[PDB]
């Protein structure tokens, strides 16, 4: 019945760097998805209470959203591009896990995923 704390977006005990590929993950890949007309279900952690989804955090143990990812990128939380890519993949998988195959949210999620993949193919 309660929401869990959201994912960490910051940590001073993790070293930091900026790379061309992380810049690209922020200003190309996240930018494209974030501005898409289907982004809104994914722009923030799922609020199980407010949305009355009591099964959500029984089912989803590794939550992730674009709000967290954007924050992570802005906070230099990732060292490697694949860390970030993994978070996107987790966001999309969770959607498929929790929602029914016929649900409009799944079709929103797959539309965003195709775009995501098309962008990752042009990583620098």
């Amino acid at each position: 019945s309660m929401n869990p704390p959201p994912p960490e977006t910051s940590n001073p005990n993790k070293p930091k760097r900026q790379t061309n590929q992380l810049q690209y993950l922020l200003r190309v890949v996240l930018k494209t998805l974030w501005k898409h007309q289907f982004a809104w279900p994914f722009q923030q952690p799922v609020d199980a209470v407010k949305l009355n989804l009591p099964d959500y955090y029984k089912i989803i143990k590794t939550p992730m959203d674009m709000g967290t990812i954007k924050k992570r990128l802005e906070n230099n939380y990732y060292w490697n591009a694949q860390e970030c890519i993994q978070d996107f993949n987790t966001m999309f998988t969770n959607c498929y896990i929790y929602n029914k195959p016929g649900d409009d949210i799944v079709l929103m999620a797959e539309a965003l995923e195709k775009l995501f993949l098309q962008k990752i193919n042009e990583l620098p």
């Binding site: 279900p41 409009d104 929103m108």
Partner: peptide, 10 residues
């Protein structure tokens, strides 16, 4: 779908 339901069904 609906803003109120986070785009989730039922």
């Amino acid at each position: 779908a609906r803003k109120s339901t986070g785009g989730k069904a039922p």
